């Protein structure tokens, strides 16, 4: 029964990616201080308790499922697609989400606003004509007042519908004040859609769409994610726990229920 660890995660034989100040979800969305994670890959993504968000305030309904899905895929490989957004203003940014000296936004999302005095009913389509599954990440903006709503989107109530042949999500923006985060009471909510080969992403909105820019490639394989503050070290160990790498030569272990790699069974 293996009962101790070194307190460090050995960087072989698995590709360990240290999140440093970034959650996987922030790396996914493209929070600017996470830009260095663009198109990264891992066998194990390590999330640290120092991680913090530094972009527009957001939530993710069913956060844990998206985090798991992405973690298991083992890649942030992103392919930009030729989405056409007729009659709207693209690339909205924020002083809450600085990239370089200037206001910015999540790299993988496209904040659409009115053009002139109009925001039309957007109706766009993106077929999956590839032989793999595509993951799309998108959102909805929740203004804090009616005046913000009509200033940005014209319509007094927006709506975002994203569908494939297999399913449909219709999100209704919720106008109102949330708790203050760094001087803002507005939020974005994040949602996702998987598009299988031969299916088609359909997006329909008359306001408040935070649009996708393209898709993330989905793989199935051995990859995962772990919450741990253990430092990474230069050594070899097959079995990793949040407490650190452990030898796997004994058949049982009581260091942690959470393990990555070929490990001893937990007790």
């Amino acid at each position: 029964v293996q009962s101790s660890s070194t307190g460090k995660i050995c960087n072989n034989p698995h590709r360990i990616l240290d999140g440093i100040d970034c959650t996987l979800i922030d790396a996914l969305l493209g929070d600017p201080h996470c830009d260095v994670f663009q198109n990264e890959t891992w066998d194990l993504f390590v999330e640290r308790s120092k991680a913090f968000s530094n972009c527009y305030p957001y939530d993710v309904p069913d956060y844990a499922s998206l985090r798991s899905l992405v973690a298991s895929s083992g890649t942030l490989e992103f392919i930009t697609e030729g989405f056409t957004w007729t009659g709207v203003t693209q690339n909205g940014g924020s002083n809450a989400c600085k990239r370089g000296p200037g206001s910015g936004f999540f790299s993988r999302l496209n904040w659409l606003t009115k053009s002139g005095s109009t925001y039309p009913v957007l109706n766009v389509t993106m077929p999956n004509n590839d032989n793999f599954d595509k993951l799309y990440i998108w959102g909805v903006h929740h203004p804090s007042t009616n005046q913000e709503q009509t200033s940005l989107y014209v319509q007094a109530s927006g709506r975002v519908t994203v569908s494939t042949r297999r399913s449909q999500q219709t999100i209704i923006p919720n106008i109102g004040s949330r708790p203050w985060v760094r001087g803002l009471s507005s939020r974005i909510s994040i949602y996702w859609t998987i598009v299988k080969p031969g299916d088609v992403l359909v997006i329909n909105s008359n306001g408040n769409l935070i649009a996708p820019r393209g898709y993330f490639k989905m793989r199935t394989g051995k990859s995962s994610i772990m919450r741990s503050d253990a430092p990474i070290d230069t050594c070899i160990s097959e079995c990793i726990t949040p407490n650190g790498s452990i030898p796997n030569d004994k058949p049982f272990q009581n260091v942690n229920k959470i393990t990555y790699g070929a490990c001893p069974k937990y007790v």
């Epitope: 203003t89 940014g93 924020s94 009509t150 200033s151 507005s186």
Partner: antibody, heavy 137, light 108 residues
Framework: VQLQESGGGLVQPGESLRLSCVGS?????????????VSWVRQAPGKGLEWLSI????????DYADSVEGRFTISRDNSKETLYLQMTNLRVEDTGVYYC??????????????????????????WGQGTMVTVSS | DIQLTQSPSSLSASVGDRVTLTCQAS??????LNWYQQKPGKGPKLLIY???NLQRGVPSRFSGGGSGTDFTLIISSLQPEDVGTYYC?????????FGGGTKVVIKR
């Protein structure tokens, strides 16, 4: 939205002068001057219009005409819905009526945390009445 | 810099006449072209934005057209209050520039 310039008057060649432009009222939303990019434009006596300088809603993407670059500085204080033009090293040929002119496209919604990515710099849909600047000995 | 040249330099026409003002740009400015009316000793007022859009509150006798290098402002039925100077203005590129103006006078 309405605009009113002030600060114009007589100055000697080589002196400085600071002009102000104050926004009051409302537009789409119930928008104030701080939603918008603004330029200064002048008109010499009997002559046409000369664009001088632009400033985006949030204070950035500043540019100047070559005639005034290095001498004039545009700035704004959105808490007072006020624009400024700080002029230095003034010359006789700077003499004219100075207008504040608001560009039409919404460039930010203050309090929302949204700013438009690009400075559009489109049509001047509101102009002030203008303030006269005379540079003479 | 982009130069705009207006024609004619001035004109007189009778109340009710159809009046055509032109603006030529020294290079292709697409439709990044606006028209203003200035009455003497007053600020300019926007008439037409982006070559052909009539500003809200402007009488429908004003219309604009063109793209690229050649633009027109048409007053379909000239009225006594239309006297003043009319300027075109481009924002395709910095510095933003104005034409030299066309002065409109009523022949009575």
């Amino acid at each position: 939205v309405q605009l009113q310039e002030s600060g114009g008057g007589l100055v000697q060649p080589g002196e400085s002068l600071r002009l102000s432009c104050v926004g009051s009222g409302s537009s789409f939303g119930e928008s104030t001057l701080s939603y918008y990019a603004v330029s200064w434009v002048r008109q010499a006596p009997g002559k046409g219009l000369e664009w001088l300088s632009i400033i985006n809603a949030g204070g950035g993407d500043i540019d100047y005409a070559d005639s005034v670059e290095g001498r004039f500085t545009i700035s704004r204080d959105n808490s007072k819905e006020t624009l400024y033009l700080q002029m230095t090293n003034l010359r006789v040929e700077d003499t004219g009526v100075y207008y504040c002119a608001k560009h039409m496209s919404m460039q930010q919604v203050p309090g929302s945390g949204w700013e438009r990515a690009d400075l559009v710099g489109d049509a001047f849909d509101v102009w002030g009445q203008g303030t006269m600047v005379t540079v003479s000995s | 810099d982009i130069q705009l040249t207006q024609s004619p330099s001035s004109l007189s026409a009778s109340v009710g006449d159809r009046v055509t003002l032109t603006c030529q740009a020294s290079q292709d400015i697409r439709k990044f072209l606006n028209w203003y009316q200035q009455k003497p000793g007053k600020g300019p007022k926007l008439l037409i934005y982006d070559a052909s859009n009539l500003q809200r509150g402007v009488p429908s006798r004003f219309s604009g057209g063109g793209s690229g290098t050649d633009f027109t402002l048409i007053i379909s039925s000239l009225q006594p209050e239309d006297v003043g100077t009319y300027y075109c203005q481009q924002y395709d590129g910095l510095p933003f520039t104005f034409g030299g103006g066309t002065k409109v006078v009523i022949k009575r």
